[PDB]
Amino acid sequence: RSLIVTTILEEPYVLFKKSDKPLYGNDRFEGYCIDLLRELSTILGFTYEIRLVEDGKYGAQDDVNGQWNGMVRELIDHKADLAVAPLAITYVREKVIDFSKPFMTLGISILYRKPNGTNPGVFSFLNPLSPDIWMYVLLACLGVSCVLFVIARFSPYEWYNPHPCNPDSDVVENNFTLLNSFWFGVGALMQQGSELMPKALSTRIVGGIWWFFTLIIISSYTANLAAFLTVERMESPIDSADDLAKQTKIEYGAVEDGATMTFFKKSKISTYDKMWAFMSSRRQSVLVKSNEEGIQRVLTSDYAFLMESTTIEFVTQRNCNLTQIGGLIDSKGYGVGTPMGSPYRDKITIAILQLQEEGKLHMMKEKWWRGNGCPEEESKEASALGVQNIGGIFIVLAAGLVLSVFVAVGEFLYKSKKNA
Amino acid sequence: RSLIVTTILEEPYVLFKKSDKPLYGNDRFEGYCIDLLRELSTILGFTYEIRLVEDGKYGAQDDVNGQWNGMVRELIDHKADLAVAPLAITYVREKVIDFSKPFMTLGISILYRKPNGTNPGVFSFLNPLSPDIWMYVLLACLGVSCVLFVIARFSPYEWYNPHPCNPDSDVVENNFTLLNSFWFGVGALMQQGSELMPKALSTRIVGGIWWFFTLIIISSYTANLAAFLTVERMESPIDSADDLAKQTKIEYGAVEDGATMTFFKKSKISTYDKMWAFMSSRRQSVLVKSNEEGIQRVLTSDYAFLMESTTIEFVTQRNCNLTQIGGLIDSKGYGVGTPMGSPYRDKITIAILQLQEEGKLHMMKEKWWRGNGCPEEESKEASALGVQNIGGIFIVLAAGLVLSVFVAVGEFLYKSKKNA
Amino acid sequence: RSLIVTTILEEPYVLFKKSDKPLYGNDRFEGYCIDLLRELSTILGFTYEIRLVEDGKYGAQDDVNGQWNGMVRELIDHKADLAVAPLAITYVREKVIDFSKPFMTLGISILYRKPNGTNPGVFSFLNPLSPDIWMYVLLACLGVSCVLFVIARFSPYEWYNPHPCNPDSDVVENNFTLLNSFWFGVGALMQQGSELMPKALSTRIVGGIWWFFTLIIISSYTANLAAFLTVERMESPIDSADDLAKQTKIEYGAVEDGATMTFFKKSKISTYDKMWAFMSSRRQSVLVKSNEEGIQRVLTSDYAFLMESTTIEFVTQRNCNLTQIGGLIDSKGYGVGTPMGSPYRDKITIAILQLQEEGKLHMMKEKWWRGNGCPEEESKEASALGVQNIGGIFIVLAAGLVLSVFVAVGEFLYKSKKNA
Amino acid sequence: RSLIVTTILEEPYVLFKKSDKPLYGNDRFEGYCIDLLRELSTILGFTYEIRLVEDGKYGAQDDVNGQWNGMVRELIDHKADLAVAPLAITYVREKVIDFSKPFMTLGISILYRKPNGTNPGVFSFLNPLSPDIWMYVLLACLGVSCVLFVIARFSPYEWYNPHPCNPDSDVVENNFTLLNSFWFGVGALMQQGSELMPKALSTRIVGGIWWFFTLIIISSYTANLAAFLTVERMESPIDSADDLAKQTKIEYGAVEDGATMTFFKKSKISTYDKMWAFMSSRRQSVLVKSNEEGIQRVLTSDYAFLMESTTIEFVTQRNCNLTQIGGLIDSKGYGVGTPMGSPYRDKITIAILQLQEEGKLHMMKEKWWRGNGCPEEESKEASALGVQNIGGIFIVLAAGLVLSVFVAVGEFLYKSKKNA
C-alpha cells in the first residue's frame, strides 16, 4: 500500500509549489524533505501520500496528561507511517517513537549583522588632534609671525649688512619682512627650515620657542595617530559566545520556550549561565517569540540571535548583511520519524547511509541552501593606509596648487600695473 | 510548626519579585537570604513562612527603658523563631540572643570615585620623559655648547677666509661665538638646523654626536608618548586608609550613629583616631544620614565614604565609576539569629558549614551581587588631544614671546647706551 | 552477564593509565570511551568488563573471502556484546551490524602549519601604506615639481639679482630650473631640505602645501608601522579546500586506503574531484601510510593533510604550530556498535541522548581533548628588526648607487661630446 | 580547678620560648594563642595548664574506624577542656566537638616571588634594531660616502665655480672632498642636513637614495621603539587565579592532602578545576608535601604556592622577595575547640567578641605578624623613560666630547707641524 507521510511546513523543507492548477495529488509539495522522500522511495520501493499534520506541531509532552501533540501524535497512534520532516532527534521523543539515523546535523549558533565598509573619513588624518587644536596652531602661526615682524624691526641686531663683501656701509636691510616672517613660522612648523634664520637674541628666543612648540605638536600628532591606528588594529570582532559573555553592549536573543532557550536553562558550561543571566533578567526585550522576528531585530538593532544552524545557514545565504559568528554550541540532528516497531526504521537508516556515501545529501543541501551567490567580499580586509582614509591630503594638495595659480596670475598683474 | 522567620527588607538580601500577579503569600520576594533560607529548610525539614518585621529596624537598646527594638526584640519574646537576615554579630546582642555561625564575612572599607583620566593636567605632554631626563637634556645643551665654544676657538681649521665672494686675503674670523654656539645646540636639539655648520673635524665630532644624541631623545619622546596614549593607566590618589588619613583635600564620610562611626569613635589605632579627629571636627560636613545619601556624595562631591564592605561590592558592580580603594578595616560577620534557648542555633551552624564546603554560599553570592560587569578594558580610539592634554605648549609659547619683548627692549637700551 | 565489550586502542579514546602497580583487570585503562561506557553502565545496569580486540582493526570486508575483520567480525559471531569505540557508521557496516545513534560528530578537515610571521618578506617595510598610496606620492612629486617649474618662471618675483656679493645690476636669473624643481620636491619629501627655498609667494604656497602634505605622509607611515609592529596579525594562504585546490605550491596529504581517500576517489564535486586529480597523479608523493606520518610532514614539509576532524582537534591543542584551516568537508559519526539482534541498540540510543541533554557528552570531550591551551596571544617585545624585516632598503640603496654610476658615465660622455 | 589546654606547635601561634631555665611550669610557651589564652583567662576567671597534644595532630577522620586522632581526640574523650590553637572550623569537626566563634579569618591565596627592578640596559635604546642592522647602517655610511667621493670627482657637473661673483674663471673646485663626503652621509643620516648639497644628477641620485634609506631607518626605529614600549606597558603582572588559569608557564602548588588540595577537588567554580587539571596531571612536581618546602620552591623556581592566608601574611612580612597575588579564594576561620556540652563555649564566644570590640585581636595580630618593616617600594612604578633605560645616550655623548678634544689637540699639532 501507499505509505502516509506526516510532515510539516518549513523552509527549505516541505513547502508549497508556486502554481495555479488546483487538482494536485501530492504534487503541490516541494523542498528538501520532498526530494529526500523521492530518493528514499526510489531505493526502498514504496509509494507514498504526503498528508500534512493537522495540528501544525512537531511534538511535545503536553504535561497535564501527555497526549503528545503534533507529528509524534500521528506516529504513536499509528495514523502515520513516516514523518519525513525536520523532526529533531531528542531524548523524550526517542522513548515513544523510533527515529531513523540523522540526515542533517545542526547545533546552536549566533546571528549578527555583517560588519561593512568603515568610512573613517577622507579627511581622517585630521583626527589625532582636536578641532580647536588645529585652529589654535593656525592662530599661533599668525600670532608668532607677527611678533617676529615687530621684534625684528625693533631689535637693532637684526639690521645686518646685506653686502658684507664690500666692507662699506649705508645699505642696511633685514631679511625679516612681513612676508618672510610668515615663511619662517610656516617653515619651522612643517619641520623643514626656511632660508632665513634669526640673528638677534630677541628673535632667537621667538624662533627657539617656536621650535619647541613645533616638536611637541608633530610628536603628539604622530603618537596619537599611532594610538588611533593600533587600537583599531587591536580591536577584533566577536567570533564566539565567550566574546558575547563579556560585552553587555551587544544584545542576545532566543525563541520563547524553544530548544535553544531550554539549552541555556540546563547549562553548567558556565559561559552560558551568564548568557542565561542576561535572558532571565532582561526578558521581554532580549527574548523574542519567533524565528522570523528574531531576524528582524538583528536587522534593526544590535541584536545577536541564537538560532539553529540550519536556518542560520539559510538566512545568511539570502541576506548578505547577516553573518554567523562562531561555531556550533549544541549538537543535534534531524531524523525521519517512525512509530515503534516499524520495519522501515532500518530500511531508511540503510537508505540514508547509502545516499551519504554517494554524496546526494550534500547535493540536496546545496540545491536548497545556496540560493544566491553573495557579492564576494569587496576586499573586507584592512590596515594598509589607502585612499579611503588618507586620501584627503590629496584634495588639500590639489587645492593648494590651484590657489597658487591664482596668486601667480595675481603677481603677473600687479607687476604689469607696476610697469605702468 | 512553620517557625515564623523575622526578616527586614534589604538589598540584595530581601527583594520583592515584582513580575506579575500580586498574590503569593511568602513567595512574594526573593534574594540572598531567601535562597539561603531555602537550602537551610531543604536540609533541616521545615518550610520558610517569612514574617517580615513591622518595626523597620534590626535591634538596638535604648538606654532610657532598656528595651530592644527591631528584630532582636522579636527573638527574645519568642514571637520569632529565626532571624534570617543581615543581622550582625555584635557583643551586646550576643549576651541577649544567640547567633549562628557566620554566613558572610565583611568589614569597613572605602568608596571612592573610579579614576578618570579626563584631567591629566595641562603639562601632560611632559610625562614620557622623567623630570631627571628633562633636566639632563637642558644641562647637555649647556654642556655641549660650552664645549663647542672652547673647541672651535682652539681648532685652527675653524678660522677661515670670511669673504670668498671677493678673493682678498689676510682675514681670520670664526663663526662660533658664544651666542652662535648655544644656537647650534638649541637648533640641533629641536630637529631644525641652524645656519651654522661645523668645519674642522673636531667640531664635527661635537656636532655629529649631538645629532645622534638628539635622534635618540626625540624618538624616545615620540615612542613613549605613543605608549602613553594607547595604553591608558589611571592611578587613584588614595589606595588605603593611612594614605587617606593624610589627604585633607579628600573629605571623609560615614553614617551618623552607625556601626562604622562607632568603630572610629572607640578606636585607639593611630590612623583611625586621626581619621576620627577629622570627621568629629567637621560633623555634618562629612557625616551623611544613610548609605544612599553617602553614595551620591561620592558621585557629586569628592569624597571618602567609609561604609560596610558587602554593600560596597554590591554598589561597585552596578555603578562603573565607583570603586573600592584599600582593603577591609574592621572584621565583622552576618549571622542568623535565633532565641536564647534554641536548638536551631547548632542545627543551622552545621548547615551553614555544609553549604560552604559544597560551595553554595559562594554560588548564591555570585548570583545576587554580580551585575553588568563594567567591561571597559577595551580602550576607545584614544582621544583627539585637546587643550586639556597638550595644552601647556600654548603657555610656554606665550611665556617665550613675553620674554622676547623684554630682551628686545634690553637690546634697544644697550644700543642707545652705546650711542652715548 | 558482564556483556563482553570489544574495543580497540586509540587516543584519546582508550588509553592505558600507567601510574602505579600493574595489576587491575579491566581498570587498566582510561579515556573518552571508557568514561562513556561508565555512564552507559551507570544508567543501564551492567558493569564494563572490556575485552580489547586481538586483531588490531575496526573491521573491513576482504572481497577474496567475504569475511569481516577487526571488531565487526567479533560482533556478528556474538563473541562481543558491544563495540564502545570510535566505530564509524558506514553503509556497508550498517547492513551487517546495527549501530547506536552517534555520540560524536565529525568530518574531513585540513591540517596546516600555523602561520608564523618570521618571513614577512624583505620589502616588508613597504606595508604601512597601500600600493595605491606609494604610487600617488610618486605622481605627486612629478605633479608638484612640474607645477613649480611653470609657476616660478611665470612669477616675476622669482627672477632676482643673482650676485648681491657685488652690487652690479642688469642680471635676471632663476634658481628653479627643471632639475632644480624635482630636487625641491624630492628633498622636501625626504624630510631633509634642499639648498633651494622659494621666494615670491606663489612658489611659497606650492612649497608650503607640499610641506604639509609631507608631514602627514611621514607621520602616517611611522604611526601605521607602529601599529603593524606591536599588533602582529598573521594570515594563512589557505582558509578552505577550494583555496587549497588552486595552490599547487601547497601539496596535499591523506592516508592510503582510508576513509578520507575513499571520499575523494568517489567524489563528484568539482573541487573534490580536482583535489583528487592532484593526489592520484602524485601518489606516494602526497600519500602517507598513517595519521602520525602525515602530521610530521605538516611539521617538516609544507603540506595539506586531509584527515578526520576529531583527530585534528586533538592534535591542534597539543602542538601549538598546527592549526585547522577551513571547516568540515564530509559529515560522519561515531556510533556504539552492537550485534544485529540486540536490545542494547535502542537502550543505548536512549542513553546517548540522555547524557547529551544533561551535558555529559560535552563535558567528557572537554576533559579528554583539551590540553595546554596555546596561550600565545600576549606578544613578546616585538622584534629587533633585522635583514628579514627592513632588509630591502639595502637592496634599493645598492640599486640607486649602481644607477648613479651609469649617470656619471653618461654625464662624462655628454661633456666629452660637448668638447667635440 | 585548672583547665587543660590541649594545643599544638605552630608559628606565630603556640611556640617555645628561647631561654635556658629548665623548670618552667607552662611558662615555656609563647605565641598568639598564648596571648589569647591569657586574655580569655583574665575575663573568664579560670586558671589553665598548657599540655601539648601527644600525637602532634590537629584532627582527622581515620576512616578505617574513625578514632579522630589529634586535638579532637583530647576533646571528644573529655581529656581536654580547651583547644586554644589554630583549630579550623570545618564541617566534620563541628558535629563531634563544639568550636567557639572565630578569632581569626583566612582563605586560600597565592604566594609568588615579588617582581623586582628590571634592568633593560643602560644602552637599552639600541634594542629596536638588530645588532647587525646597526652594523650594516654604519657600513653603509662608510660605503655611500666613498661612492659620493668617487662620483663627485668624476662627474663634470659638480666642478662648479667657487667664486661666481666675479664672472672670471681658472678656479674650479668641488665642495665634495673626502671629509665633506662623510659629513653628508652622517649629516643626512641624522635627519639634519649638512651645509653641502649635491649639484650633479649623478650625485643627486646618491643623495636621493641615501635620503630614502634614512627615512625607513628612522621610521622603523621609532615604530619598533613604540612597539617595545607599548608591549611592556600593556603587560600587567598576575593578580588572580583567573590569571593563573591561563598561563601554563607559571607553575602551581599545594600541600599533599591538605585543606587547600581538598578544595580544588570538590570545585565547580570552573576556574579551579582547570587548576586541579594542572595538579592531577603534573603531580609529584607541582604538588609538594609541606608548607615549608612550598616556600622554597617559590624561592627557587617560578612556582605559585597555594597556602592559607594566615601563613602567607606571615612569610611575606619576613621575606620581601615574596608577595601575595590576589585575594581570598576560600573562607575559613579559627576557633577555640571545646567538647560537646562545655559551658565555656558561650563564655569564650562572649569573650572573643569582647576582645574584638576593644580591638585586642588586631593588636595581637600586629604584635605577631608584623616582624620587620620591609624596604618600602624603591619606587616600583615605571613607564617614564629615565636614566636606567635611556641613560646610555649620555655615555655616548660624553665619549664623543672626549674624542673631539683628542682631535682638537691633533689638529693643533698638525697645524704646528705645517708651520715648520
Ligand SMILES: CCCCCCCC/C=C/CCCCCCCC(=O)O[C@@H](COC(=O)CCCCCCCCCCCCCCC)COP(=O)([O-])OCC[N+](C)(C)C
Ligand atoms: C621632543 C622633545 C624632546 C627633546 C627636546 C627637549 C627640549 C629641552 C627643554 C626642555 C624643557 C622642559 C621643562 C622641564 C621641566 C621638568 C619638570 C616637570 O616635569 O614639571 C614642571 C614643568 O613646569 C614647566 O615649566 C614646563 C615648561 C616646559 C618648557 C620649558 C622650556 C621651554 C623650551 C625652551 C626652548 C629651548 C630649550 C633648549 C635649551 C635651552 C612643573 O610643571 P607641573 O604643572 O607640576 O607638571 C606636572 C603636573 N601636571 C601634568 C599634572 C600638570
Ligand SMILES: CCCCCCCC/C=C/CCCCCCCC(=O)O[C@@H](COC(=O)CCCCCCCCCCCCCCC)COP(=O)([O-])OCC[N+](C)(C)C
Ligand atoms: C616615510 C616614507 C613615505 C614617504 C616617502 C615615499 C617616497 C616616494 C617613493 C616611493 C617608492 C616606493 C615603491 C612602491 C612600489 C609599490 C608596489 C609594492 O608594494 O610592491 C613592489 C615593490 O617593489 C619595489 O620596487 C620597491 C622599491 C622601493 C623603492 C623604489 C624607489 C626608490 C626610492 C626613490 C627615492 C626618490 C623618490 C622621490 C620621487 C622620485 C613589489 O615588491 P614585492 O617583493 O612584491 O613586495 C611584496 C612582497 N613581500 C613584501 C612579501 C616581499
Ligand SMILES: CCCCCCCC/C=C/CCCCCCCC(=O)O[C@@H](COC(=O)CCCCCCCCCCCCCCC)COP(=O)([O-])OCC[N+](C)(C)C
Ligand atoms: C634612529 C637612529 C638610527 C640611525 C642612526 C644610526 C647610527 C649609526 C650606527 C651606529 C651603530 C651602533 C653599534 C651598536 C651595535 C650593537 C653592539 C653592542 O651592543 O655593543 C655595545 C654598544 O655599543 C654602543 O654603545 C655604540 C654607540 C652608538 C655609536 C654612536 C655613533 C654616532 C655617529 C655615527 C655616524 C655614522 C658613522 C660614519 C662615520 C663617517 C655594548 O652595548 P650593550 O651590550 O648592548 O649594553 C648592555 C645592555 N643590554 C645588552 C641589555 C642592551
Ligand SMILES: CCCCCCCC/C=C\CCCCCCCC(=O)O[C@@H](COC(=O)CCCCCCCCCCCCCCC)COP(=O)([O-])OCC[N+](C)(C)C
Ligand atoms: C633667555 C632664554 C633662556 C631660557 C632657556 C629656557 C630653558 C628652560 C626654561 C625653563 C625650565 C624650568 C622649569 C621648571 C618648572 C617651573 C614651573 C613653571 O614655571 O611652569 C609654569 C609655566 O611654565 C613656563 O612658563 C616655562 C617658561 C617658558 C619660557 C622660556 C622660553 C625660553 C626659550 C629659549 C629659546 C632658546 C634660545 C637660544 C639662544 C641662542 C606653569 O605655571 P602655571 O601655574 O601652571 O600656569 C597655569 C596657567 N593656566 C591657569 C592658564 C592654566
Ligand SMILES: CCCCCCCC/C=C\CCCCCCCC(=O)O[C@@H](COC(=O)CCCCCCCCCCCCCCC)COP(=O)([O-])OCC[N+](C)(C)C
Ligand atoms: C630605467 C630607468 C632609466 C635610467 C636608465 C638606466 C641606466 C642608465 C643608462 C644611461 C644613462 C641615461 C642618463 C641620461 C643621459 C646621461 C647624461 C644626462 O643626464 O644628460 C643631460 C640631461 O640631464 C638630464 O637628463 C636631467 C636634467 C633635465 C631634467 C629632466 C627631468 C628630471 C627627472 C629625472 C629624475 C626623476 C626623479 C625625481 C622625480 C621627482 C645632462 O645635463 P644636466 O647638467 O644634468 O642638466 C642641464 C641643466 N644645467 C645645465 C643647468 C646644469
Ligand SMILES: O=C1N=c2cc([N+](=O)[O-])c([N+](=O)[O-])cc2=NC1=O
Ligand atoms: O523536532 C523539532 N524540530 C524543529 C524544527 C524546526 N525547524 O526550523 O526546522 C523548528 N523551528 O522552525 O525553529 C523547531 C523544531 N522543534 C522541534 O521540537
Ligand SMILES: O=C1N=c2cc([N+](=O)[O-])c([N+](=O)[O-])cc2=NC1=O
Ligand atoms: O584544623 C586545622 N588547622 C590547621 C592549621 C594550620 N596552620 O598553619 O595553623 C595548618 N597548616 O600549618 O597548614 C593546617 C591545619 N589543618 C587543620 O585541619
Ligand SMILES: O=S1(=O)NCN(C2CC2)c2ccc(F)cc21
Ligand atoms: O541527537 S543524535 O541522533 N545523538 C546525539 N548527538 C551527539 C553527541 C553529539 C548527535 C549529533 C549529530 C547528529 F546529527 C545527531 C545526534
Ligand SMILES: O=S1(=O)NCN(C2CC2)c2ccc(F)cc21
Ligand atoms: O563576630 S565574629 O563571629 N567573631 C569575631 N570575628 C573576628 C576576629 C576577627 C569575626 C570575623 C569574621 C566573621 F564573619 C565573624 C566574626
Ligand SMILES: O=S1(=O)NCN(C2CC2)c2ccc(F)cc21
Ligand atoms: O552516518 S550517520 O549516522 N547518517 C548520515 N549522516 C549525515 C547526513 C549527514 C551523519 C552525520 C553525523 C553523524 F554523527 C552521523 C551521521
Ligand SMILES: O=S1(=O)NCN(C2CC2)c2ccc(F)cc21
Ligand atoms: O567556617 S565559618 O565559622 N562559617 C562559614 N564561613 C563563611 C561564609 C563564609 C566563615 C567565614 C569566616 C570565618 F572566620 C569563619 C567562617
Ligand SMILES: [Cl-]
Ligand atoms: Cl556558635
Ligand code: NA
Ligand atoms: Na526509540
Ligand code: NA
Ligand atoms: Na632640515
Ligand code: NA
Ligand atoms: Na603603538
Ligand code: NA
Ligand atoms: Na550567649
